[PDB]
Write a protein that binds this ligand. Structure first.
Ligand code: JQS
Ligand code: JQS
Ligand code: JQS
Ligand code: JQS
Ligand code: K
Ligand code: K
Ligand code: K
Ligand code: K
Lengths: 348, 348, 348, 348
C-alpha cells in the first residue's frame, strides 16, 4: 500500500507522567536561578507562568495579581468587546502591568482587536481549537499587517507543520496543546490530540529554527509537570486548573461536603458556550491567594533547575535530558505505601 | 524451531485507547464535512452508523429511527422468521426506509433469508462468532448464487486472511470485530481476539484491494472511538452499548437506585441464548430519544474530521495519521484532576 | 563490562493478560474438538486439567471427581505417609481412576514414594519451590532408577535450562510456574519469577525437543487463560484457585457477609506450614459441584480451539498464534462500560 | 538539530515493579547463604540493611537494635551537634556497636563531623538532595583530607557521572536514589529522578570500576525489592518506610480507627523542616520489635538468593539476571483473584 496508509501507526508520543528529568552536574542554587523569559522584546516575564484565557480563570483581578507576581494573565473572550477593553484598561492602569486578551478567529476578530489595542493590551491571543486551520493562518496575517508591532500569540497547535505555518503567517509566539487540559474532552469526543510533552518538543523543534517561543498550554497538574514542559522546549507554560481555585479567579467559592471549592469549566463546555461540547464542568479546591500557589510553582521549578544544573531557562531547554518510565515508574515517583495525614502545599 | 513456533508472539495490536489522531492542516468546517458512506450502490448511508442486531438494541422502532437519522438498523434474529420479516416489512412501509436483518449461519439460514427478501430487506447480515469458518464461506457463496444482487454483510472477522476469504466468497461488506464488545467475554473465556483498531486496519488493508467496505463492530464507548475506527479504515461503525439505552431500543426502562436504566446483554449471554456463554447481562443508563445520541456521535465525528482536514470519510480513511500513547497518555486525554459536577451530553 | 553484567535487563516476559489468540481459518466445531492429552503412555487424560496438590484443593474426594471428569487430582503431601497412601488407594478403588500424589524433595522422599507406589499411584509429583536445584535433579535420578516405569512429574521450573536438567534427570513430565499463583507471594517476597506465558513457552521450547509434556501450573483465573497456556506449548494445566471453591475440595464452606466461601491458601503460607512465608491465606467463592466448573472450563477451551481451527491440542500447540496488547487492550477484552447485573457461570 | 536536543527522550528506566529475577541453577540452601557485606575494611555488616537517617526512623535506640541485628543505623541530623554526638556515643558504648550519622553539606558540616568523630562514629553520611552538586564534591574532598581513614558515605546520586565524581572526590561508599522514597515528592514537584533499579544499575556500573560499594536508598516496599536492588548491583539497601513502624524508631505510636500507627514523614516535609517541600507527612502501621521485620526481610533475601543460586551477595550482583514485565506481569506477581483473610508477616 502507499505511504500514508502504511505510516498510520508509526508515531509515538509521551506525556508528563511518562518521563523524569535526569539530574545533572550542578553548581547552581535553586534560589539563585533565573526564571525570567523573553516572549518578545516588549513582552518579558519575570516568571514563566500565564493564566489561561478562561471565564473561570482570568479576569482583571487575576491578571493584575499574575502581573504583580511577574507573570501574565489572558483576559477571556466570553464578554463584550467593550467590557474586555475595560478590563484590559483596568490592568494597564494598575501600575503599567502587562496584560493579554483572548480573541476568537471569527469574522469580527479585528473589531475586538481594535478596541483591545486602543486599551494598550500587550498581547493578543488568537485562540482557536484548531490553529492549523487556513482561517487562523489568514487571520494571523491580517492582524500582523494592520498591527506590525503587536505581540500575537496564536494557537492551539500540536505539530511542527502547524507551528511553521503560524510563524510564517506572522505569530511571534505559538501556543501548544490539543486536548491535554484537565477539563478537556477533545481527545475523547473527537479522537484527536498529541501527548503534550511530545507536542511541546515537536513544536519547539520547529519554532527554535525561527527564534520563536512556544507556550506549553494544558495538562499541568503538579509543579514538576511545568518543569518537564519547559525542559521539553517551551519558554513558558499556561495553566487553567492549577489557577482556577485561587482567590483572584472569577467566580465565587462554594461549600460542598464541608470543603471549599471553585467552579472550573472548559470553555467548550455546555455552560461556557451558553451543542456538542469538548469540555466538562467541574470544581477544584479553593487555594487562597494566588501568591501562595505561584510560590509553590516557582519553588518547584527552581528545585528542578537546580537538579538539572540550569542557571536559566535557556540552559534548561537546551540541555536537560529525560528518561522514559512505565506506570510502575510513575507510582514509585509519587508517594506510595504510606497513608498521607496532612495536605502538603504542593501535593494533594 | 520451525516458523510457526517462533512467530507465536511477534504480532502486536492496538485498541482505541492506545492512540490519538494527529491534527492536520485543515480548511474544512465541521458543519460542512460529508459523513455519507456508500456501502453499496443500493445501500448508501447519510451517517456512518449501524445499530447492532441484538435483542436489546434493534427491532423495528429502532430501525425506523436509525434510518430516519440517515443510518441503518439490523433487526436481530432472536425471533421467528415470520416475525422478523414482519418487522422488516414494517420498516420498509414507514417511508421506504433502509433496513437490514441478521441471519445465523445455520442449515435453515436460506429459509429465513427467503422471507426477509420477500419483505424487501436491503441487506442481510450473516452473523457468526467466527466468520473465518468454512461453513460461513460456504453459506456466503450459496446466498450470493441465489440472490446475485442482494447486499450481503458477512462477519465477524479480525484478520486480512478472513476478510479475503469472505470477499472472494461473495460478501460485499465485511464486519470486523472479535471480542471488543462492551458486553463480550469471548476474549476472557475463549482467550481469542484482536485489539479492535488493529483488527479494523488489518481487515481494511485487505478489503481496500477489492473495493469492499468494512464495518468496525464493537468496543466503541465514546464518539472519539468511532472517529478512530473510521480513520483506521472502516467505512461505518456498528454500536450496541451506545444505542442500548435510547428510547427506541427494545426492552423497557427500569429504575435502579433512583436512576433510569435499560437492560443490555450479549447475544451469547445465558439470558439471550435462552451453556458456556461468551457474553454477560447488564444495564446501561437511559439516554432518551435516539436522535440526541446520534447528534452527539455525528457532532464528535464532524469535529474530528475538521481537526484532521477531512472533507469526507474517504479523505479520513486515506490520510488520517495516529500517534501511539501510554496509559498515562489516556489519563491525560480524559478529564483529570477535577471533580466533574454535571454530566455532559457526550461524556459521563 | 562483561557479558553477564550487560545482559541483566535484556529479557522480556509475557503473562496471559498481555496477549490474545489470533482467530484462524477453521472447519472445526467446538463440540467436535478433541481435548485429550497424553502425558505418558500410562497417563492419558480425557481433559487437560489437573487439580493442584494443595491442602485446600485436592484430597481423595476431589481426585475421584477430577478423574471421573477425565482429568487428574494430585493428593497433597500435608498428611502422613500412611494417610496419603490410604487416600491414593481410596481413589484407585473407586473404579480404577487415575490419581497422582505430591512428594517433597527431602531425605525421606523415597519412603513416602514407596508407600504411594504400593498403593498403585499413577504419578508422583516431586514438588518443590525451586526445581532447578541440584537436590531435585538428584532426587529425580534416584526415583527413576528405583522405579523405571513410574510416571514422574517434576517441578517447578520456569526456564529452558531447568527443563532440560529435569528431563535429563529422568522426569517424563515437567511442571512449569514460579510465582504466578493467585495465593503466591514468591515474586513479592523473594523477587523471583518469570511471567507465566513466557515461562510455559520457554520451557515447552526445550521440552518439545525431547518429546516431554509440560504442565502450566498457576495464575489461570479465567478459562481463556487455560487456552493461552495450552497454545503457548503446555500439554495440560494445573489449577488451584479455580478449583478451591468446589464442593469436592477439602475444607468446609463458610458464610461471610451473607455469601458462601471456602478457604484457599498457599502451601507456603503460615497456616499451611504449621517462618518467612511465600503465600497468603484467603477465601474464594463457593462454586458448587466440580462438574459445573469443569464444564465451563472445557467449554471455553472448545470455543478457543474452534476459533483457532484446532481439532486437537497438538494442532493448537503447534499452530496457534498470539498478538500482544496493552492494558488498554485488556480492558477492552473484558466487559466494559456496562453495569453487570448477573453473575455469568464463567465470569464474575 | 544538535546532539543534546535530539537525545532528550532516548533513555529508558526501570523500577522494581518492572522486573523479576530469573531463577537459576542452584545448589545453595537459603539458610546457608551469606548475606554479609563489606562496605569498607572498617565497616562490615552481617546483614545488608541500613536504617535511614530520618527523624522518624533512626535515633540511638534504632541504631543499637540495627547493629545488634548485624546492620547499621544512621543517626539523623535534625538535632544539635551535641545531641547527635551524644547519641553516637550511646551506641558505641552499648557493646562497641557500629553506628553512622548524617551531616548536611553546609558551611558548618566540618564542625558537626568533628564532634561525631570525637564520639567514634564509624561512618559519616554526607546527605544531600542533589549529590552531583559542586558543593558536595568539594565537601567530600575536604572531609577526606582532614580525616583520611574516616568512612564517608556520600549522596544522593542517580547517574554514573555523579557516582564517578563522588568517588574521585574521596567517598568510599555512594548512596543512590533520587525520588523513589515512599514519602518523597521530588519527582512530582521538581520533575526530576531516575527509576531506582536503573539508577542502582547505572551507578553500580561505574562504581564497580573503582571497587566502591553503592547503597540502594529508597522505594523498597517489600523484601523482594531489596533482592532486586542488590541483584542490580547495590552492596546494601537503605530503608525508611519499612523500618518507621517498628518499636525502636523514634516517635510514639498512635491509634487511628482502632489500628496502631507511627508517624513517618519526609525529611523535606513541612513538619520535618520546621517552604516548598519535597516530601509529605504520613503514618505507617505499627510493626512491633525491629527484630521481627529484619527476620522477614533477610528471610526473603535468603529465599531470593537460593532461587538465583547465589551463595553470597557478590555472586548475586555479578550473575543474577532479570526479565522485564508489564503491569499485567506485576498483577500476576502479587496475590490476585482471592480475598486475603489474614495479614502475612511479609505481605499486607
Ligand atoms: N479543548 C480542550 N481543552 C480546553 C477547554 C475545553 O475542553 O472546553 N477549555 C480550555 N481548554 C484548554 O485547556 C487549558 C487548561 O488546561 P489545564 O491547565 O486545566 O490542564 C486551556 O488553556 C485550554 O488550552
Ligand atoms: N462475543 C462478543 N460480543 C458480543 C456478544 C456477546 O458476547 O454475547 N453479543 C454481541 N457481541 C458483539 O458486540 C457488539 C456490540 O459491542 P458494543 O458496541 O456494545 O461495544 C455487537 O455488535 C457484537 O459484535
Ligand atoms: N509459591 C507460589 N505459589 C504457591 C503457593 C504459595 O505461595 O504458598 N502454594 C502453591 N503455589 C503454586 O500456586 C499454584 C496454584 O495457582 P492458582 O491456580 O491458584 O493461580 C499451585 O499449583 C502452586 O504451583
Ligand atoms: N526527597 C525524597 N525523599 C526523601 C525525603 C523527602 O522527600 O522529604 N526524605 C527522605 N527521603 C529519601 O527517602 C528514603 C526513604 O525511602 P523509603 O524507604 O521510605 O521508600 C530516604 O532514605 C531518603 O533517601
Ligand atoms: K516517591
Ligand atoms: K483531557
Ligand atoms: K469485551
Ligand atoms: K502471585
Amino acid at each position: 500500500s502507499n505511504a500514508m496508509w502504511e505510516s498510520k501507526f508509526v508515531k509515538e508520543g509521551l506525556t508528563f507522567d511518562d518521563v523524569l528529568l535526569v539530574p545533572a552536574k550542578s553548581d547552581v542554587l535553586p534560589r539563585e536561578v533565573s526564571v525570567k523569559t523573553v516572549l518578545s522584546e516588549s513582552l518579558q516575564l519575570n516568571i514563566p507562568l500565564i493564566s489561561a484565557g478562561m471565564d473561570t480563570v482570568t479576569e482583571a483581578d487575576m491578571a493584575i495579581a499574575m502581573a504583580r507576581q511577574g507573570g501574565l494573565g489572558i483576559i477571556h473572550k466570553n464578554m463584550s468587546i467593550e467590557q474586555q477593553a475595560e478590563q484590559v484598561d483596568k490592568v494597564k492602569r494598575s501600575g503599567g502591568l502587562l496584560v493579554g486578551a483572548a480573541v476568537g478567529v471569527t469574522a469580527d476578530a479585528m473589531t475586538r482587536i481594535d478596541a483591545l489595542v486602543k486599551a494598550s493590551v500587550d498581547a493578543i491571543v488568537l485562540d482557536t481549537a484548531h490553529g492549523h486551520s487556513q482561517g487562523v493562518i489568514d487571520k494571523v496575517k491580517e492582524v500582523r499587517a494592520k498591527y506590525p508591532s503587536l505581540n500575537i500569540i496564536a494557537g492551539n497547535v500540536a505539530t511542527a507543520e502547524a507551528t511553521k505555518a503560524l510563524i510564517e503567517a506572522g505569530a511571534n509566539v505559538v501556543k501548544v496543546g490539543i486536548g491535554p487540559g484537565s477539563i478537556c474532552t477533545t481527545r475523547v469526543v473527537a479522537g484527536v490530540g498529541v501527548p503534550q510533552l511530545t507536542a511541546v518538543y515537536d513544536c519547539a523543534t520547529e519554532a527554535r529554527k525561527h527564534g520563536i517561543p512556544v507556550i506549553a498550554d494544558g495538562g499541568i497538574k503538579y509543579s514538576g509537570d511545568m518543569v518537564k514542559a519547559l525542559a521539553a522546549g517551551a519558554h513558558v507554560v499556561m495553566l487553567g486548573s492549577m489557577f482556577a481555585g485561587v482567590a483572584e479567579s472569577p467566580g465565587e467559592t462554594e461549600i460542598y461536603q464541608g470543603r471549599q471549592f471553585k467552579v472550573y469549566r472548559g470553555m467548550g463546555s455546555v455552560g461556557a458556550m451558553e451543542l456538542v461540547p469538548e469540555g466538562i464542568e467541574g470544581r477544584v479546591p479553593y487555594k487562597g491567594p494566588l501568591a501562595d500557589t505561584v510560590h509553590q510553582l516557582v519553588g518547584g521549578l527552581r528545585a528542578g533547575m537546580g537538579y538539572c544544573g540550569a542557571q536559566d531557562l535557556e540552559f534548561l531547554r537546551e540541555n536537560a535530558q529525560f528518561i522514559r518510565m512505565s506506570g510502575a515508574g510513575l507510582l514509585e515517583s509519587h508517594p506510595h505505601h504510606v497513608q498521607i495525614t496532612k495536605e502538603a502545599p504542593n501535593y494533594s
